[PDB]
RNA sequence: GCCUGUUUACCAAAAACAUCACCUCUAGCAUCACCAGUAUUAGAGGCACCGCCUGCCCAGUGACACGUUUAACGGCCGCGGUACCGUGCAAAGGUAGCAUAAUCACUUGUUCCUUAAAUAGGGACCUGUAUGAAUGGCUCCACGAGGGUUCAGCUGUCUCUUACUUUUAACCAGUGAAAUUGACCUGCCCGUGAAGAGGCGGGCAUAACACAGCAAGACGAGAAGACCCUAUGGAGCUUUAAUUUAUUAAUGCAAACACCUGCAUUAAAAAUUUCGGUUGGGGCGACCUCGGAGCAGAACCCAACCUCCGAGCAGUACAUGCUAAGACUUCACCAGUCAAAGCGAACCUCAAUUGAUCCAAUAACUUGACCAACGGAACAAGUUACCCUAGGGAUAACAGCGCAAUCCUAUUCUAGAGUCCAUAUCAACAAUAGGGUUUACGACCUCGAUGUUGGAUCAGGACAUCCCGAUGGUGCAGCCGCUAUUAAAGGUUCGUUUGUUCAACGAUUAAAGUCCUACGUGAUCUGAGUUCAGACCGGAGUAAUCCAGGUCGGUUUCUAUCUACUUUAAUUCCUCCCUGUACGAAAGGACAAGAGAAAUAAGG
RNA sequence: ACCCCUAUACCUUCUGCAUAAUGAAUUAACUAGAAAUAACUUUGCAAGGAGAGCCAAAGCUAAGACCCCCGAAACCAGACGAGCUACCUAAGAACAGCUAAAAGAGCACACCCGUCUAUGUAGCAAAAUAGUGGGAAGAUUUAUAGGUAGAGGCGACAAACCUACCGAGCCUGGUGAUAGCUGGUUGUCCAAGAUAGAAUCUUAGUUCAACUUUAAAUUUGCCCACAGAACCCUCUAAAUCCCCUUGUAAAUUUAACUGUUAGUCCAAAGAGGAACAGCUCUUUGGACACUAGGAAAAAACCUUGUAGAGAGAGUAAAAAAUUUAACACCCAUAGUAGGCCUAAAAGCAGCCACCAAUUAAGAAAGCGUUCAAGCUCAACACAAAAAUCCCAAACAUAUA
């Protein structure tokens, strides 16, 4: 299979683990700002 | 696909196929316009070849055929050959393709290609597949020895499905499925017309040769600016109905149809089926002829032959209003034959006279009766008549509380009125 | 339709990189065109191969290019060059290591 | 093509945050690395295999002492994903010939020069 | 096909071979055939009684002659003008006859008869540029286990099977094999995997053994597959493949005075040997050596039946002489490259631009192959289905498997059809998904065999539903319909031609569904088709022989060891009535409820 | 004993076999590595050695130690075969009955043959049985003896038949034919060991390279700091080469060889195909053709490898997560039915203007009207489905 495929090519398991580990983690603002004055 | 076409026109001299009405230059010009229609290719070379036996397999004689194949093979720029011979038989197509080394197209195949490439309809695609079913000698330009011995030989005492058996089975199955799908599409097209038939709209089919101005005439009659006539051949692909108003204030459907062509199996073109059935179910037929075209007589003969082959009702053949369009191109024109309306679609010269003429024709054909009827006011009889019948005129008697309405009403509507408001 | 193109690689290029001790006659680099031009103590063969004319250390430098006045194409290129422009080329030099020789006492006449 | 990886130099430029996190002062750097192979050389390039053999880390989880010098550091950079590197600490200084036989490398990375095997 | 006969003993009995008859060719002669014969004879052949005939052509090949010959091999047309008026070419332009043929395909040609219906049969055609005249053409009497069609009758062929007798069978007694067998303590489902699991993973099931049946599986037994490919493996046959004429027959020259011997030449007959490789299986096509540029961006090197360009020289010089360190090197070798210094002198361009050894020519120096299959056999082609052997699942055909180009299905898009109106029903340009029914493509299991079209029999399963059930919408007035949701319990016809699956047609039905199951099922059956052996026609070839052309014929094995299995509340139509009612202008025309009849299926 | 847990017979072949690829019922016996050159080891003697010959610039002499089995269709020579069959020669025999009449005539026995069906298919039979059928006074059938012999015979050509298997008989011999092809190749134990290509009637093989093994000599081998390696081309990658240090211990050369030169997936750069294939072809690397654990089963993914015993211990990789569409309410006068246009087309059929008043409203943003009329808007106010039967059981909360 070419590097560029019409379908989402299956990633090597280590690459999948790398992506899952390097997923974006948003900043948790401790107390939710919605119910602060 | 950026093809290069050699237009080979068999000029039939003596015997059947000799065209007294038209000339070879006109026919080759027609073929050139046909091929230009497809937007993909154009004529790179044109050869008019005399032939005295057009009905034989090779069309041309031995010497002429050798001469043609000599040029076709010598010139490499040609990608295909268009044979202006209406329809080729399968053996003729096979022999010519094998000899010339390139695909050979006839008028039938070229028109199928027009429909498929321009009007990308399922009807056209299925028709092209149906006509393309005969498939052998895949590698043209060369005769390939094959040596098919020993393929699928008997294993113990018998053999499985051999070639030319599998081909036959696939051919039969494909023909059956294409026919069934075409039948389904025909049923759906028929379904589209049920409401129109129930409402009993007077329906008029505008028929004629290509570029006679059917679309332009319908545009002039209806007043719809959306209609876009074109100078291209077979511009009015697909059949469409447009509403228009007559001087009698009646609403009438004009069925813009696909223009007809000389030397073409219209009955066997599936894309023409909508046009043919719509003219069959039409109440009146409007025959548009471009008198300016030099081939007017041949065009009229071809269209009339197609209409006759349709086996339409005798009353439908009769009273077919003939309209001579493009009269402005001819500086001074006088219609010798009676009952023909000379009009100029672009300039709208005879449109009023045509409107009156086919209004009378519709009144005769649809069976609607023009009559004066007395309706009590505040009954809603008047509103019911307004909706269900055309109302030429209204004259209310102030004292009596009634109104005399001159109305054109069908038998169905008249019966409904009598029952609903006795 | 496409025939030929089966030729193998010439195995050309640099045979002696910088800092390599090279004996007289050793081929330093083989090239099809003039990629590296001959420097001091480096000769060119008929096929543009660079060979060491002396025994020493190979050094690659960038030096201004002044072609022979009879090299018409290069002279035309120079004539078309804008003022202030100077051509540079990669030159290969062989810095001789040993001296030409020594004076030895042979006879005490 | 898969090739040898050139690690950009900025990767090995410690920041003050890293210094605070890992407890190592940029001045007065440690002299010796304790290196332990924590990953198999199988399924890794032959050059990494050869570098591991050169460093003498064939056996996993077997500490080896190496100089904290640029060349050894280059080799360790080549094979850094297979090894754990810690600074060798000498709370009692370098072992002397007298106590050379009583040394022990504690898990903390300290090479104690007295090993009595008795409670404190 | 004239007929009676003959033939592949052991798959083909035929239309094939022969055959009277006709015709061609050869031979003027005796003591072993012909023949104890002598041109009305004998031999070598073709064709095939008979009847009408057997048309034109000797240019080419052959043969005979020193031009002839087609009942020798064989052949028997075009062009321009508007059938006939002119012309080109050829040896002659296919004549008579017949004609959809046993005659390439188109083909189920088009018609009429025949049938309810006919791809069959028969009669016809402006029916054959692939008919056609002793490669014999038409007609026709008889004859044929030949191949088609058909009237009438007959019948268990079938609708639709049943009963009985015998054999077989099972049981008792005697006697007593065979292939086969790695071991087996030998289950089902799903998934996996060397791409179809009894043995592996997850589940489920599970006391033990007999006996009788069955044939779904053990890729079951059987034959080291006959299909296909490969092998510098065979053999048969044909030649116009290479090499020969040893051998015969002639001649000529010698020798001897016609014969014999020797040497040549020409034929006849033969003999020996070969029939390259790559190859998305083989074949066809293309290619085979060298150089430049990308793929391969930067030391080198890199494949492709990948993309593109080129070469097989030319020009100038005659020191384009001789020697010699050191290096490069097309990944080996062979070969090919560069070159300091020195002698002798003066004061090569070019990317490829070529070829070894042996052997020939030459006094020598030197020269010699588009040996291009280009590391080069000194010189060898076809065909095989009459085939053979060794192998190959390294490699094709069936099947499975991958994939989804092709195919099928569903959504999104809101242009356009739909009188108006995108969405009742559709729908261009496109987008997103799903399925694994087709044709492929790949070559992963199987070539010490996985038997493969259609049909019979029995069917298991899916639902993407043809009918029956329920339901929403409608361009749903009613009747018919169309469309969508849900539903797989049950059902889903009989016939004519055709091997057809299918298709068309006839008559029906509520409907006559789409698929999967090794295109389910040949250890249950049939072999009509289908590129084994025979043969004919048309065509190809000099011939052998061949043609994904037609056509007539053509051996269907297996006693069951194991697994598995062998007695598990029904649907539908129609009749009356509702009712000529609702609905509808008419035409037409319902539901629901009720009553009655049936048909099929199951069980008796 | 079983029950528990773990465990996919062996050999061969292959990229890879539990494989539903080969062989094997099993026991006993038999059944398959022959040798020169040159080297190596060990003696003897030594510028000489050797029991004439031969070798010799430390050689020579002697010894030790490496080279399989079965299998074709075939080819040729000489015998043997015509008691079967093909044809022929000699001299014999048979052919009822009926119809017809001197007949390659008809029906029909005997007799010969073998059309079609069934059975049989290790059978009664290595071609039969039952029925059915063709001929049956002739070109018939048939008994006896003889003849034609394989480069051949014979043939009403079916490449027929020639002692059951004739594209050319059978036997013996050359012959242990040959086979780049298949199969097999028998004690224990340890160790090293999977590498580019070129040429080839060659791609099923071989020779040379490369790799690999052994022994010996020597000294650098690998990793790698700067510096350095092209323009074409405007930009233009991961990298590579070279390379002191350094960490390491290997490398080169000499001598003698074999075997592998039919290969799979994965990551990456690409090419072909269709940005299909478990597809094909190159390059870098990995793994597999070796062990173990994991991803369910599992050659190629991940962890991990150097080997033994232990009823000790710390660990490596290692278990999927997701559930998703409500929505305004009120109100509308208006210069006028803005003009033209049209039979009328009046916000609302078409074009142009497209303002303006009312606190607040586009000469109206959409339906509707024959045209109107009537109803609203902006403006005021207030995802998916297939074919044997889903597929571990289940579980939301006790402190990583
Ligand atoms: N002078 C003139 N030209 C006219 C007239 N009518 C039509 N034409 C021209 O001919 C063209 C015909 O186009 P259409 O009217 O679309 O053609 P059609 O009659 O539908 O025919 P198809 O395109 O074949 O379907 C017009 O576009 C004009 O170019 C006329 O009355 N006079
Ligand atoms: N080098 C070389 N040798 C040749 C050439 N021609 C022939 N030979 C030699 O001769 C052999 C070829 O023999 P043939 O084919 O008979 O040669 P021929 O020249 O065609 O004919 P003859 O002269 O009759 O041999 C080669 O293998 C060489 O031995 C050539 O052009 N070059
Ligand atoms: Mg064969
Ligand atoms: Mg190149
Ligand atoms: Mg006969
Ligand atoms: Mg007979
Ligand atoms: Mg005979
Ligand atoms: Mg037979
Ligand atoms: Mg016989
Ligand atoms: Mg028979
Ligand atoms: Mg005959
Ligand atoms: Mg019949
Ligand atoms: Mg018994
Ligand atoms: Mg399974
Ligand atoms: Mg049993
Ligand atoms: Mg089977
Ligand atoms: Mg079997
Ligand atoms: Mg075999
Ligand atoms: Mg051979
Ligand atoms: Mg080299
Ligand atoms: Mg070669
Ligand atoms: Mg045959
Ligand atoms: Mg064989
Ligand atoms: Mg297949
Ligand atoms: Mg395979
Ligand atoms: Mg492969
Ligand atoms: Mg087997
Ligand atoms: Mg459903
Ligand atoms: Mg299939
Ligand atoms: Mg058959
Ligand atoms: Mg023939
Ligand atoms: Mg047949
Ligand atoms: Mg028969
Ligand atoms: Mg059977
Ligand atoms: Mg049985
Ligand atoms: Mg098994
Ligand atoms: Mg097995
Ligand atoms: Mg095998
Ligand atoms: Mg066996
Ligand atoms: Mg005899
Ligand atoms: Mg008698
Ligand atoms: Mg008789
Ligand atoms: Mg024959
Ligand atoms: Mg034959
Ligand atoms: Mg025999
Ligand atoms: Mg042998
Ligand atoms: Mg080992
Ligand atoms: Mg260990
Ligand atoms: Mg509002």
UniProtKB/Swiss-Prot annotation, chain A:
List locations, semicolon-separated.
Mitochondrion
**What stretches pass through the bilayer?**
none
Q: Write out the similarity annotation.
A: Belongs to the universal ribosomal protein uL10 family.
Q: What is its quaternary makeup?
A: Component of the mitochondrial large ribosomal subunit (mt-LSU). Mature mammalian 55S mitochondrial ribosomes consist of a small (28S) and a large (39S) subunit. The 28S small subunit contains a 12S ribosomal RNA (12S mt-rRNA) and 30 different proteins. The 39S large subunit contains a 16S rRNA (16S mt-rRNA), a copy of mitochondrial valine transfer RNA (mt-tRNA(Val)), which plays an integral structural role, and 52 different proteins. uL10m contributes a single cysteine residue to a zinc-binding site with mL66.
Protein name according to UniProt: Large ribosomal subunit protein uL10m
**Species classification:** Eukaryota, Metazoa, Chordata, Craniata, Vertebrata
**Entire protein: which part is shown?**
30 to 66 of 261
Swiss-Prot record, chain B:
DNA damage among the record's keywords? no
Q: Which cofactor does it need?
A: Mg(2+)
Q: Which top-rank group of organisms is this from?
A: Eukaryota
* Protein source organism: Homo sapiens (Human)
| Expression tissues | Ubiquitously expressed.
Give the UniProt keywords, A-Z: GTP-binding, Magnesium, Metal-binding, Nucleotide-binding
Q: The Hflx-type G domain covers which part of the protein?
A: 202-366
Sequence positions that bind Mg(2+): 215, 236
Enumerate the GO terms in the molecular function aspect.
GTP binding; metal ion binding; ribosome binding
Q: Which residues bind GTP?
A: 208-215, 234-238, 256-259, 325-328, 344-346
Q: Which residues of the full protein are shown?
A: 94 to 515 of 516
Question: Which family does the similarity line name?
Answer: Belongs to the TRAFAC class OBG-HflX-like GTPase superfamily. HflX GTPase family.
Q: What is this protein called?
A: Putative GTP-binding protein 6
An example GO CC term for this entry is: cytoplasm
UniProtKB/Swiss-Prot annotation, chain C:
Q: Which GO terms describe its molecular function?
A: RNA binding; structural constituent of ribosome
Segments forming a coiled coil: none
Gene Ontology process terms (BP): mitochondrial translation; translation
Provide this UniProt record's keywords sorted from A to Z.
Mitochondrion, Ribonucleoprotein, Ribosomal protein, Transit peptide
Its domain of life? Eukaryota
Major location category of this protein: mitochondrion
What GO terms fall under cellular component here?
mitochondrial inner membrane; mitochondrial large ribosomal subunit; mitochondrion
Q: Where in the cell is it found?
A: Mitochondrion
Subunit (UniProt): Component of the mitochondrial large ribosomal subunit (mt-LSU). Mature mammalian 55S mitochondrial ribosomes consist of a small (28S) and a large (39S) subunit. The 28S small subunit contains a 12S ribosomal RNA (12S mt-rRNA) and 30 different proteins. The 39S large subunit contains a 16S rRNA (16S mt-rRNA), a copy of mitochondrial valine transfer RNA (mt-tRNA(Val)), which plays an integral structural role, and 52 different proteins.
Family in the record: Belongs to the bacterial ribosomal protein bL27 family.
Q: What name does this protein carry? A: Large ribosomal subunit protein bL27m
Question: Could you tell me which species this protein originates from?
Answer: Homo sapiens
Q: Which residues of the full protein are shown?
A: 40 to 148 of 148
UniProtKB/Swiss-Prot annotation, chain D:
- For this UniProt record, give its keywords in alphabetical order, as a comma-separated list: Mitochondrion, Ribonucleoprotein, Ribosomal protein, Transit peptide
Kindly list the places in or outside the cell where this protein is found, as annotated in its UniProt entry. Answer: Mitochondrion
Where it mainly occurs, coarsely classed, is mitochondrion
**An example of a Gene Ontology BP annotation on this entry?**
mitochondrial translation
GO cellular component terms?
Answer: mitochondrial inner membrane; mitochondrial large ribosomal subunit; mitochondrion
> GO molecular function terms here?
structural constituent of ribosome
**Entry's family note:** Belongs to the universal ribosomal protein uL30 family.
Indicate the quaternary assembly. Component of the mitochondrial large ribosomal subunit (mt-LSU). Mature mammalian 55S mitochondrial ribosomes consist of a small (28S) and a large (39S) subunit. The 28S small subunit contains a 12S ribosomal RNA (12S mt-rRNA) and 30 different proteins. The 39S large subunit contains a 16S rRNA (16S mt-rRNA), a copy of mitochondrial valine transfer RNA (mt-tRNA(Val)), which plays an integral structural role, and 52 different proteins.
Output this protein's name.
Large ribosomal subunit protein uL30m
